[PDB]
Amino acid sequence: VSPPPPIADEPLTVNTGIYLIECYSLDDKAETFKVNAFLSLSWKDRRLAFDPVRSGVRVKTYEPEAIWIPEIRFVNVENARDADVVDISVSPDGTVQYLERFSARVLSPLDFRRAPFDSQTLHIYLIVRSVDTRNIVLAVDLEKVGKNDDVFLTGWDIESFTAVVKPANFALEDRLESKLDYQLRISRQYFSYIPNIILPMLFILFISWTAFWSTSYEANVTLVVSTLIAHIAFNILVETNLPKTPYMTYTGAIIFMIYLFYFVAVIEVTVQHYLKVESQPARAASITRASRIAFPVVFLLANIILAFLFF
Amino acid sequence: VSPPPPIADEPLTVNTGIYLIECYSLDDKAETFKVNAFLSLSWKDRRLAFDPVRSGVRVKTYEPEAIWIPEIRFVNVENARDADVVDISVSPDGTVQYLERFSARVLSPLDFRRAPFDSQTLHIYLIVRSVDTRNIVLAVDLEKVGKNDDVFLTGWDIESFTAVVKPANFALEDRLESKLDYQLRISRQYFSYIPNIILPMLFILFISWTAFWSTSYEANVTLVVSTLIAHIAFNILVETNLPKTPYMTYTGAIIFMIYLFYFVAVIEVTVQHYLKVESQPARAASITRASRIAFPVVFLLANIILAFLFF
Amino acid sequence: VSPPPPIADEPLTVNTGIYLIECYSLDDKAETFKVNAFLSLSWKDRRLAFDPVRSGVRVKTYEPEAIWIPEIRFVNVENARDADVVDISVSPDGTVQYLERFSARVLSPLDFRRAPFDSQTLHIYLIVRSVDTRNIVLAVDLEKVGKNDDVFLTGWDIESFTAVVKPANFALEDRLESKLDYQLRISRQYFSYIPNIILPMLFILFISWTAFWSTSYEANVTLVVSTLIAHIAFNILVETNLPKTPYMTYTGAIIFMIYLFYFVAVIEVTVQHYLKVESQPARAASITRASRIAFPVVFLLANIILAFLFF
Amino acid sequence: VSPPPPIADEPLTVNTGIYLIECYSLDDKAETFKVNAFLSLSWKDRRLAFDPVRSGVRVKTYEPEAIWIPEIRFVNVENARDADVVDISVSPDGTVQYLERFSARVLSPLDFRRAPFDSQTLHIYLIVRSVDTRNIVLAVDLEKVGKNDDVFLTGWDIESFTAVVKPANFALEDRLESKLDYQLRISRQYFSYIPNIILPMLFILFISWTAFWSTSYEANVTLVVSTLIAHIAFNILVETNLPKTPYMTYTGAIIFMIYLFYFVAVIEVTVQHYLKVESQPARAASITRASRIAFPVVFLLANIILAFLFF
Amino acid sequence: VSPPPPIADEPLTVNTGIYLIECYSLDDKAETFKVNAFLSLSWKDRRLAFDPVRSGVRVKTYEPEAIWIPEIRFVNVENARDADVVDISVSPDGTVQYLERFSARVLSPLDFRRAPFDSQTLHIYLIVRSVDTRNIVLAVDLEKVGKNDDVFLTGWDIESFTAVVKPANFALEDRLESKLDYQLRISRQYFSYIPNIILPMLFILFISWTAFWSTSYEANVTLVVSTLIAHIAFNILVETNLPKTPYMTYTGAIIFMIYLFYFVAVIEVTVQHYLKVESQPARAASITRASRIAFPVVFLLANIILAFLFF
Numbered sequence A, B, C, D, E: 001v002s003p004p005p006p007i008a009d010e011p012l013t014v015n016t017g018i019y020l021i022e023c024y025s026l027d028d029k030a031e032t033f034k035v036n037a038f039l040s041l042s043w044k045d046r047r048l049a050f051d052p053v054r055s056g057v058r059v060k061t062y063e064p065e066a067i068w069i070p071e072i073r074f075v076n077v078e079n080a081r082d083a084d085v086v087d088i089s090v091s092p093d094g095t096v097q098y099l100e101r102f103s104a105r106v107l108s109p110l111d112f113r114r115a116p117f118d119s120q121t122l123h124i125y126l127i128v129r130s131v132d133t134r135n136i137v138l139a140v141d142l143e144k145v146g147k148n149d150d151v152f153l154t155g156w157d158i159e160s161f162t163a164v165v166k167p168a169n170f171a172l173e174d175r176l177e178s179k180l181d182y183q184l185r186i187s188r189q190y191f192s193y194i195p196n197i198i199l200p201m202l203f204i205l206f207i208s209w210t211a212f213w214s215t216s217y218e219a220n221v222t223l224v225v226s227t228l229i230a231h232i233a234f235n236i237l238v239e240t241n242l243p244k245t246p247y248m249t250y251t252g253a254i255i256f257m258i259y260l261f262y263f264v265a266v267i268e269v270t271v272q273h274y275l276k277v278e279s280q281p282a283r284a285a286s287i288t289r290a291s292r293i294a295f296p297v298v299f300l301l302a303n304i305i306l307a308f309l310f311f
């Protein structure tokens, strides 16, 4: 079966729609998500036209094999989608209404700069390659674009699922390709990071600062080095979940900066001891008293500066 | 093959049943479970009717291809179910009895608020899309809904497997859809968490409180910081298994609260030392004596308050 | 093709056999194992009978499609077995001899009570559903039940592979089902746990008891808390491999009990210090001297009691 | 269907092209990458030639089954590629233009010597085995070799995707094989390793060197041993991601060398204490003062030497 | 299609060959490897014979369906191999030459006794079951056994790929089975274990021995216990990669033995302190001086003895 012939030299418009049924497994590190949706397609094939008076029927149902169907593929998929044709309906004028249900592992990158206080635009790109007889162009039927109310992406809030209605038409290997951009706008549920990582991480840092109210070098060394190790554990846990980005992230900046605070606290603890040994405890006392204010103040300003740069 | 024609304008009732054979792999983090069950379907197709006297046979067996079979799908599946037709039987009146055995990875969310002392309702949603000629409606044949006594979900107790008999009929992409809710009510076997996480986690906390019967700052620092680190390890272990929830959980509340106890114990240990150094050990002694009672009392009340709020 | 017709009203006996070729991937946590075996089936179909004198041939080979074959399924499988038909042979009386080679992920639970000194009975349940015309019953042909000498389950010793010859015949959804129990009796190779977990775990415990020959509180705190942390690491390692059981296990009991020994050692260390500070070292000395004997004695008796209760 | 016959004695030239659509999952440890691309093939089959007047069509579309297609395989794949034929077009002279879209897990090794400041050449080898009637030879159609501008390999920069135009023609099992080398030149985005591993790892090392400004053996032992343990954690994290190479890597050399610095710091700390105890603090003081300069200087030179050897 | 008939009562010889293209994913813990190779088969079918003068053709190419092909399976595979037929060629005498390209996950056990200084013999067992009409026997065509020079098993050196030319013929379920043993002899690239595990593990042990040049109990306790914990980390890392063997391994013996050295060092440190407290430092001094020589000497001899027993 060949494609529908043109009345004049007009391209064949394949009207499309994606209706999300299930949306799951957003793997931040892999920059992939899994989708289970309806894909609706509609085009006119005048060869399939019939008089509803003579045929009696208002619609005709065909099996995929029986008629010409455009080869629509997804651009940003890992492997070709698992699809199962739900229905093919032909109206008297030869307007075909195709509907399939698919599942695919979509590969769409994320911007980790503001994580875990980030929003993302996930993309699903539909594409059609033109044939030798006819040039095929994609369209968005907005009435057939949507999502189920139940659609739950774990740890994310779904804001919108819309399509950029004008296709990106371009030549590829001396044939026209018509690409459509479906955008799933989501935003991260940052809540759990506050009691699980952020607050634990701050408590261990504040525990290191108790060394500014201690003259015991042996105890201070323990306080600052032990807490530094706990910070390393959190840094490792975090980087095992976040992918390695060519750009600096907000979480990255904060986690790194905190190392400097541990490093400088070790210097303070060392300086204080050296002076106490050198029989200069008055000077050590001045440095320790300053540190008590300096450390939280510099920490607060540094965070204000970082938050400002990133948001 | 087209759907059965109506005797008036009645919808086609497809009677359904799910009989669980195997029920496994409840992945709390993924909010998925795997099921292996029988799916039974029954509808009347008058075109298949026969006189048992003339045909001799009381029943006729057909191959799926030979007759019209309704396209029943599962809503909340990752990928389309692996199904293998067991039997298709037609009675003289044209009543079809279909039976298949399937396996599917069902995606049903969990409420982690009371974990690990939680119960869940897992769902399996059956659905059928209406055709242009006939509107298809699902029904529950209660005699064909059940589970094997052997059905064992590891780390969970199966309470019930029932169906909400009235289908949810609604329009989707300008066609009627008939949805049925099958509910598997389960409850967590919390036992192992008591000797594995809960009691170990309490023992390390109580070990930190031995610092209230010690004047050795260096030893106290070791006690409180070491145990804090062991608590961090347990917190990490727990959050690697529990998914990140937009809501506060009972396990989350407790784990977080305990950090405050470690933080305040470090403050106490610091204050006690500072005073001992400042040649004020009487005041330090009063604070230490109070802490001995205050810490367990506040811990017990805080837990009473939390348990109350959550249960 | 319909099932073979009965001479009188007798059920159709399908003689079965399973011959293990490969037996691998026993995942204790998942309570699954993978099997690769021969499945042999044999039944009489009088319609296939021939005179070996007239036909010349002593046997006839058929393709699965050519004849009626009973639908045999496995009960406790995750997904339906990957099977590839090896041979179908018909004798002059119409006795069919079917042989296929399959692979399946069998789901059979384990009793972790005595782990790692435990034995298990793995099961493979064969089943057949009766048809409308004839009732099908399973049988065990013992000459066709066995295992390859090479069959190696890693970390386990294969004791036996036998079948419970009497099938479990029962009604399920108003049809007879005939179930056969194939049992693979195995026993754990516990050896490696002795040098890898058991002895390391005891050495760290005995290191904590060296605090009973020390008056240095600071050193004792370090000994007992450090070793407690190493025990937590081993506890975590162990529970990451063992599934969460609703019952107490031998490994669970021991690992838990050891926490009590660490907890009580911390109390001893605390009491000894308090008394030494209170200028009562004679009393502290008596308590420390007792602990030296009490701790190993109570440890040995507690283990004797536990081993007795579990074995 | 047999291969096209030769006019003369010429081999059959199959012109090839690979156009990368998606390029993902570079697993350094596994030395594999996943690709999703177009594979274009073109050859002349004079048997397929036609008159466009008689057939009406100027080009003919065939299903793969309908005609002879060369069996092109990938050499360095794990499993045979998932391919889905996009189009097969025959021109009146019998010139066939085949296009499929595939996904494959390509197995191409990496040189970890300069990691994470390394570049790689990934390979995709196309191959065709000659038949008994005709010898088949591969060619590169450069106009059909390329990549999408969007093609993003996470944590890597794509430099080029080119083909070595001359095939490697050789005998294999008494038949000619024609192999083509497609090369994807990439280079690692090393950035994230600086704040995540490199700088944390240096800070802990520099913290160990604060023991050269301390006379407290107990504190020094803590500083050097604690930081040594944090270095072990980083070493483990790194080797869990990098494969085990038979050659020394730059990351390997650095990580190993740092152990020597920790080992020697422990010796210094031990020597300093021994002398202080032996009532020789003047000698200990000289050794400690030297260490303050020696340790960073030797560290800097050692790194200069290593960087020089590796780059 | 039936098998070739015998001239006289002779078995049918199927000549075989395996030519490795790709050899990857040796999973020591799983005792599996993945292979991608050519499988060549050749037998005489006199029914396929032709006169090359009358037929014109020197060879005939058949589709698998067209002729009788022996059912060859692999014994030690997880699941049946993914195979794709490359060619089937018949010579005038009826000599068939079959060639397919396959991929399979082969399950062949390893002897971990000498790891990581171990060599292995991996096996690929080819098998054929005799049919009722003819008995089938396997043979090795040595000209068709080989490997690509590029064949690279990561972290292993490929020494040889040969076949044991005489098959293992045996009866299985009253039919002859002919088994061929293909052996891939490999040897581990132990290099990386020296800088990654072996040398780090020795450095931490030697750091524990610095306690023999210290009178500070508190510091010694820290040295020996901290390093013991780092040894536990390495032991865990190692056993997460090595499978649990019913026999003692070289790596196992060494790792275990080292615990005894840590245990005894703790005893020495304890004895030294007890004596120092008991105002007997002269005796403690003698014990400490002995330990300085005893510990390395006993370590070196113990290793000599172990290496001797294992190699």
Ligand SMILES: CCCCCCCCCCCCO[C@@H]1O[C@H](CO)[C@@H](O[C@H]2O[C@H](CO)[C@@H](O)[C@H](O)[C@H]2O)[C@H](O)[C@H]1O
Binding pocket: A024, A025, A026, A027, A028, A029, A030, A115, A116, A154, A155, A193, A197, A198, A238, A240, A241, A242, A250, A251, A254, A255, B029, B030, B243, B244
């Ligand atoms: C500002 C101070 C520092 C703040 C703390 C740092 C938090 C920064 C955000 C880190 C984001 C982590 O991103 C983490 O990625 C992994 C991917 O490997 C996800 O991992 C998993 O997610 C869900 C289960 O929950 C699965 O459906 C998914 O398939 C799986 O990959 C985690 O659910 C996600 O949360």
Ligand SMILES: CCCCCCCCCCCCO[C@@H]1O[C@H](CO)[C@@H](O[C@H]2O[C@H](CO)[C@@H](O)[C@H](O)[C@H]2O)[C@H](O)[C@H]1O
Binding pocket: B024, B025, B026, B027, B028, B029, B030, B115, B116, B154, B155, B193, B197, B198, B238, B240, B241, B242, B250, B251, B254, B255, C029, C030, C243, C244
């Ligand atoms: C109140 C103080 C704190 C109490 C301690 C905290 C306990 C809270 C409950 C945590 C629930 C953990 O939930 C954990 O999730 C993972 C999913 O990644 C499951 O993981 C696994 O389960 C089984 C094996 O056992 C598999 O069939 C499944 O496929 C797999 O994912 C764990 O079996 C489950 O137990």
Ligand SMILES: CCCCCCCCCCCCO[C@@H]1O[C@H](CO)[C@@H](O[C@H]2O[C@H](CO)[C@@H](O)[C@H](O)[C@H]2O)[C@H](O)[C@H]1O
Binding pocket: C024, C025, C026, C027, C028, C029, C030, C115, C116, C154, C155, C193, C197, C198, C238, C240, C241, C242, C250, C251, C254, C255, E029, E030, E243, E244
């Ligand atoms: C008495 C004191 C305490 C003694 C120490 C405690 C030991 C108790 C027994 C623990 C049993 C651990 O059980 C562990 O389970 C996991 C499943 O996740 C298995 O894990 C793996 O096994 C093999 C590889 O070896 C694979 O084929 C399998 O697919 C995989 O899951 C481990 O091989 C098994 O050993």
Ligand SMILES: CCCCCCCCCCCCO[C@@H]1O[C@H](CO)[C@@H](O[C@H]2O[C@H](CO)[C@@H](O)[C@H](O)[C@H]2O)[C@H](O)[C@H]1O
Binding pocket: A029, A030, A243, A244, D024, D025, D026, D027, D028, D029, D030, D115, D116, D154, D155, D193, D197, D198, D238, D240, D241, D242, D250, D251, D254, D255
């Ligand atoms: C000079 C001092 C030391 C410097 C620090 C050391 C860094 C050296 C380079 C280490 C390279 C690590 O290489 C690491 O390999 C694993 C493979 O298991 C990749 O692992 C993963 O990558 C991505 C997700 O992020 C997936 O698409 C991929 O399938 C998966 O395997 C890591 O993304 C990669 O970064």
Ligand SMILES: CCCCCCCCCCCCO[C@@H]1O[C@H](CO)[C@@H](O[C@H]2O[C@H](CO)[C@@H](O)[C@H](O)[C@H]2O)[C@H](O)[C@H]1O
Binding pocket: D029, D030, D243, D244, E024, E025, E026, E027, E028, E029, E030, E115, E116, E154, E155, E193, E197, E198, E238, E241, E242, E250, E251, E254, E255
């Ligand atoms: C004598 C003192 C002690 C010496 C140190 C101890 C070393 C002893 C040898 C340990 C062998 C470890 O064996 C380890 O097993 C795992 C199996 O999951 C392999 O794991 C992985 O290997 C490669 C990637 O590198 C993959 O293709 C493979 O699929 C994967 O399983 C490791 O590559 C292997 O190295």
Ligand SMILES: [Cl-]
Binding pocket: A072, A073, A074, A075, A077, A079, A080, A081
């Ligand atoms: Cl697609």
Ligand SMILES: [Cl-]
Binding pocket: B072, B073, B074, B075, B077, B079, B080, B081
């Ligand atoms: Cl479905």
Ligand SMILES: [Cl-]
Binding pocket: C072, C073, C074, C075, C077, C079, C080, C081
């Ligand atoms: Cl099955």
Ligand SMILES: [Cl-]
Binding pocket: D072, D073, D074, D075, D077, D079, D080, D081
């Ligand atoms: Cl391929």
Ligand SMILES: [Cl-]
Binding pocket: E072, E073, E074, E075, E077, E079, E080, E081
């Ligand atoms: Cl096979």
Ligand SMILES: [Cl-]
Binding pocket: E169, E170, E171
């Ligand atoms: Cl025999």
Ligand SMILES: [Cl-]
Binding pocket: E130, E135, E174, E175, E176
């Ligand atoms: Cl035989």
Ligand code: NA
Binding pocket: A001, A064, A065, A066, A067, A068, A069
């Ligand atoms: Na079509």
Ligand code: NA
Binding pocket: A222, B222, C222, D222, E222
């Ligand atoms: Na300490």
Ligand code: NA
Binding pocket: B001, B064, B065, B066, B067, B068, B069
């Ligand atoms: Na049908």
Ligand code: NA
Binding pocket: C001, C064, C065, C066, C067, C068, C069
């Ligand atoms: Na059949």
